[PDB]
Amino acid sequence: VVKMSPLPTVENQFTPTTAWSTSVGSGIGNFYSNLHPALADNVVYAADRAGLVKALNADDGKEIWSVSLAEEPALLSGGVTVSGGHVYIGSEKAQVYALNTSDGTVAWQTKVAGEALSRPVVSDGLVLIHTSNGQLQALNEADGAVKWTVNLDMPSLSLRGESAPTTAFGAAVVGGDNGRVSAVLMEQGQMIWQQRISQATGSTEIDRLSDVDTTPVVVNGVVFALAYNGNLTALDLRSGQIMWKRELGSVNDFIVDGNRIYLVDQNDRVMALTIDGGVTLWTQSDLLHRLLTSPVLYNGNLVVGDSEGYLHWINVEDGRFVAQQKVDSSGFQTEPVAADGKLLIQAKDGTVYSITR
Amino acid sequence: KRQVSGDEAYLEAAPLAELHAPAGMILPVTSGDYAIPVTNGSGAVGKALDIRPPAQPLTQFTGDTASLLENGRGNTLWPQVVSVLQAKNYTITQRDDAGQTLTTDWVQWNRLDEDEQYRGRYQISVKPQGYQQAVTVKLLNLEQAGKPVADAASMQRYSTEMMNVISAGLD
Amino acid sequence: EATRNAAALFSVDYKAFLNEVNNLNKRMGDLRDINGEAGAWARIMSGTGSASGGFSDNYTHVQVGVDKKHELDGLDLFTGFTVTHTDSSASADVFSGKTKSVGAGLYASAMFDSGAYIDLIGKYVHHDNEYTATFAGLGTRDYSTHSWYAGAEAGYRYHVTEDAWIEPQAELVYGSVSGKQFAWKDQGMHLSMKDKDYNPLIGRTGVDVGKSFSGKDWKVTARAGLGYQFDLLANGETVLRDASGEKRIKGEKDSRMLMSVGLNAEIRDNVRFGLEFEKSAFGKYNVDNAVNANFRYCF
Amino acid sequence: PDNPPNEIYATAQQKLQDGNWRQAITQLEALDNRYPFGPYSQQVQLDLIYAYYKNADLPLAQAAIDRFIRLNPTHPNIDYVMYMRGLTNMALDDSALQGFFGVDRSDRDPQHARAAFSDFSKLVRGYPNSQYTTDATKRLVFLKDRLAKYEYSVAEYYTERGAWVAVVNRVEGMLRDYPDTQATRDALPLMENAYRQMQMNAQAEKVAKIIAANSS
Amino acid sequence: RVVYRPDINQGNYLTANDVSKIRVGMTQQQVAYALGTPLMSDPFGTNTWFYVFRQQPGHEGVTQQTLTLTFNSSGVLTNIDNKPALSGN
Amino acid sequence: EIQQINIVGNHAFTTDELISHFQLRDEVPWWNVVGDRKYQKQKLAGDLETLRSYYLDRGYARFNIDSTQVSLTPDKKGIYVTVNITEGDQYKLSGVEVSGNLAGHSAEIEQLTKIEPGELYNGTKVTKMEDDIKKLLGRYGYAYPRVQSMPEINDADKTVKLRVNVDAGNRFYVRKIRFEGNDTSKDAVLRREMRQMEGAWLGSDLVDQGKERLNRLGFFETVDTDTQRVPGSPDQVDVVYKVKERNTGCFNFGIGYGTESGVSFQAGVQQDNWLGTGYAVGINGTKNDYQTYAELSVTNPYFTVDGVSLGGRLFYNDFQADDADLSDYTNKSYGTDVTLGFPINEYNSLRAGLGYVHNSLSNMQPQVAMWRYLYSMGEHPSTSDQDNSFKTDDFTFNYGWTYNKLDRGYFPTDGSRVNLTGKVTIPGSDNEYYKVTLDTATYVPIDDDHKWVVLGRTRWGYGDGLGGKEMPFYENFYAGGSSTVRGFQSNTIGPKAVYFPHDLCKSDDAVGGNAMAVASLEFITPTPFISDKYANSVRTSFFWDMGTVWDTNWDSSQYSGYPDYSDPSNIRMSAGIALQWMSPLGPLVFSYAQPFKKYDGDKAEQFQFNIGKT
């Protein structure tokens, strides 16, 4: 295709090496989802696309248990979430699995109405899953027991990778496939308020995505959302009011530094924005349209991936390619995870690679 | 060339004769659209008809009309007509009354082939003050062509076309 | 006798090369009058000839092919593939045989805005003959060989008039054919004749005038002219050993002349008409060609 | 290339005079599409009509007639355009090798003749004071006789087969639309025979009566 | 002789029930509704109507049935006539 | 480019076999490039409808598409499509009932609606019921009935009952039948083929048979029926047969001025439809220092208006081949015949007639078969010498039987055509014999598209003399070439003449065997390199051919040294690819065949270029 893919510049200030590799199996492959593991008591829980799932020991990469959930394949979609002594998973075949960690056999299996693209989340004794149809469901941990199914509206053009709701003050907020970010009180299933921060600033809706599918992050009262067509918005939890707006947006994954906020543009443009006015700090143009992943904070620095398998490092001030890493030649399409001062990046066949600094 | 493409077979058509019902009899024939209105002749039939685009004036050309209809020194057409009557046609108007601007020309023998030997006539011209621009008539006289004298709606337009195109050239 | 008979077959092979030799607007179609670089053409002919000593022959060549390319800035070059099949029958004083050859190759051409055009072609074929002669005790035998034919040509079209163009042209072609070695020990004596690979070359300069009227009123693409062909190289070397002694033979050059052709007038979108001319060179070597004229009227 | 219209138009009419319809129409189309709203491009369209008609490009001639009549519903030269449309239909109808062998193209498809008759009828009804009316009327007579012959042939076949009421309907329509042709006069005996074969002679005496009245 | 002569039908057909619906003293419109539109009428002189049923299965005697309905020139039924035909050949 | 398709929400069938029926494809299989992997919304909807049908056809009546979602990767390169459904449950066809103002044909509808009890619902058979009930009501002449179907469902009993309401409407009659497009052929030739007689009650089957017969006439490239009601009376319909006339017949001419042959002259015309008159006229001739051949033939298929045809021919064949004495003999054959024929039903025709022939042959090359023939004639000339002359004249009676049911007139896609031709002598003729030949061509497709089809050709022939006699050799069968076993050579298979010394010398040339039998199987597939418009103008076939011809009179005892010729077991076998092209110049063929099981004297010609007939 006629699309510019600039080469990565060479810069180095320190050498990080891979702590270990895993090679769980035929994982994400050429698909696209939010398969990222979870860490608990120095044990990571990696999930394989083909129904396999393996727990691994940290700092040594030692297999703990590994079981397959084949049906036929399984097509796991949701991310890895852990609560109590159990892990919860959603699959593309419209099913949800509750596994009991070390045992491996599913503690309880139930069905859901639609694909479980949304990253599973546990909150207030209920797990919230957003199906790829315009519905969100609250499930009980005992055995299924769908608490409610809140309906949503969406046009037949929405990009996948749906938003992950977040809870605060007993109410869970989640974005919409048309921009209608909404809040729902998560004990009875009633929808309080919503607003469309995504402005259809184009000619015809066919080329306009204009949807938000990324998880919001709450700080006191402020919270954020990011639509594909742009429309960055700061909005407050009390109701549908907007403190400030910006016409850059175009992000699907972002983090907060407490004082600064990072983002990744469609053209692969990364800037740091402030709380009040959202003024850019710097930018990087080494990799344009190279499909980098979310940046993650680590020891006062930022770590990012790419669709070429060339891991990149960014300084917290003005940015700098402190280190560039090469571990796979096919690329990365996963979401980075950091915990206990350790970084893990998923691959297709080598799957999880744990790095050392 | 110069005629219709097809043969003249239809010229030999059978006569169109109707029929009459007898006593105590009706006839429903008058119930269609295939009715041929009666019309006089005096028209060029067979290959004698000259199918050829009716060249437009390039205004008023209902009959032999050749009046001139935006110009201020519009009187400059008469010296231009003198230039036209100069090497342009090598023919000074028969009555070049430029003072009265009634520069009536003389019959000529201009030719344009089309299986015609020559076709020239005295395109009489007079310049009144009518319409927006300085008016100047181009009313032709009897057209000669190969015939001694003859005139037709298209034929008169042919001679008038010569006055039409040349006068418009002055623009 | 035996030595001269092979030379006639080599001359027939030269004639086969001569039969393979054709024009630029005929073998691969006219470089012009075809608007699309993508097009399919063919070549069907049936020639004849004779020489002193009863060496007569008649050949029929049927070839097809296609080409496909795009446009450029000033030169609309095109190229494509083609296949060919030739079959000939010849008779001699005490020799008579039929030969055939199936082959595949590629063709290319390029014309400039100044009227000058160039063309090239290259084809590999598997030619097998089967003939019977009673001299040398050989009798009847069939032999096969691989023939790589390479040809280049060019022409300078002059826009003499709207229906006349005197276009000089010149061509050069070289071909490689592996020879055949055989001993006549079946008759009792060795009489072994060995022929090596032949890589002869030949050029040709031709002046022609083509008149191409159109509109279906005349629609006659007549083409008169003449050409002279000279064999640059001739590698028909054969070494023969027998009771009398050892002898060697080698090829000879050419000084041949060729005349014009027929009318070839396709009148309408449903009819056709054409003719061809043959050169009856009786005085020189009793040479000749094949001439015909026909046309097809389909309702 | 483009230039002042003087030279291009002059060359256009000059090669029209020479009769080179190919180059004439190429030039005219180029000039028209170059200046789609020129000062007197209507003359160019009329020349397009003439070139199509004389070059045997009849479908394009018909299309250009339709376009011109749509763009110019009223003009001092509509009669010429309609006459050319009728001529186009006429010429499309009758021309083939049967012209060489002299075979009456009478029982062939009549659709083109019907359209030509309709257009000539429109013209003659419109402007009887024009100059093409006499030739038009002669063509009307020829076309009407042709249609009558076609219907006569159909009736003849249907009688030959034995379908004794389809013939009645055909000849009755023939009478209802072609009151003054030879075909109906010759087809009246077909009426007589058909009515005879139905064992209902009551109309057959009336048919014989009208036949005797108009036979003379 | 013996050659294949295809079957031929030559008019609007009718049955006994269709005939029984007919009574003198009704208008053209609804009788046409009852019996269908006549195919062969008489525009000569009177405007009477015919209903002919013909069937020739090929190499068999033709079967005919004629129903002639004569009307006044106003739009109502004047009188009727039926004929099983089959007279002569 | 599309990436993934999912039918999540089902627990009755596997995803793969369900998506197999989709025209849209999610991934290319390994060892083929048959299909593509793009995204098209309209065919997504089409495949959705197909999925709906493939659930409703097995008693899943309570099925409905809950939703369908199409999405995109956040890279605008790969697309996923999901469908969420409701399977429902299995159901059984409770029964069928009929109702409405149906016509007196209730028995036919009731019989046609009968369904085996205890079986489950299937929408395909139901749709077939409405379609063919409409066809039935149209056969008696109800072109516009209205039918409705209601599937009442009792879930508590797992039953579905169908209530079908039928409204016949009104009778329909044809007012006129008008043709369009026939520029040249007279209206008579098209009208005489009809079966829906004008001025009568309409029959849809009659119109269909009429269009089929126009197709089978064989000089119309395309024909389309259209039935439309007049805007006048409530019940009257006009019928139109929109045709598009094609080319047929060719006039050809040529001259062969050359040294080795002097002057050769060739000319001729052959039309199956002369100027639209409907006749069939074929005349041709050629003159040469070795050849003087000419023939003339004229046939009228409609001498009388029932189907009766009358046709005759004459021919002069005094070629006088003299030079080089290469398996040739001086011969003048002049003759004529006249025949008449008639149909016996809608699809079968008989034909018969009489013929006169005369043949004079002199200076015959010696070979055993012809010497035996002459000995049977009662003449005993010298073996080594070749100077005798033989004059003969024959009265003869010939006959034929033809069955023809083809979807089209030339390279069709259905039906079968068989033709038997018998040729007997009668008393008063010098020769006493008879000869029977038979041809058969059966076309059978594999799908309703009628683009892929299998073809079976069979040819048989056998004859003999009577009263202790034998036919002349010059009227014997032959094999090899197009319209026969392909690729071998023009007339190469059969017994080979045994030359007497001038001991016996074998000849490569053939004399034709008294008993011939060949067969052929062809796959016919479209041409991928041809656009849509010309798609129905060419034909590509893969052919497998077998054949065998021999002489049933072969005294193998007297010449047992040479190979036996009375053995039919010596089968031949070839195969290859044939390309039939229809051109403004006519029909052409092109075959590149490789013989599999071949014999001596094959003279293999892997490139045949027959023109005409095809």
Numbering used by the authors:
A (entry chain B): 29 to 99, 107 to 392
B (entry chain C): 32 to 89, 97 to 107, 109 to 210
C (entry chain P): 1002 to 1300
D (entry chain D): 28 to 243
E (entry chain E): 25 to 113
F (entry chain A): 176 to 677, 698 to 809
Task: Pull verbatim passages from the article behind this deposition.
The outer membrane is a formidable barrier that protects Gram-negative bacteria against environmental threats. Its integrity requires the correct folding and insertion of outer membrane proteins (OMPs) by the membrane-embedded β-barrel assembly machinery (BAM). BamA is composed of a 16-stranded β-barrel, which, in E. coli, is preceded N-terminally by five polypeptide transport associated (POTRA) domains that extend into the periplasm. Unfolded OMPs are delivered to BAM by the periplasmic chaperone SurA, but how SurA and BAM work together to ensure successful OMP delivery and folding remains unclear. The results suggest that SurA binds BAM at its soluble POTRA-1 domain, which may trigger conformational changes in both BAM and SurA that enable transfer of the unfolded OMP to the BAM lateral gate for insertion into the outer membrane.
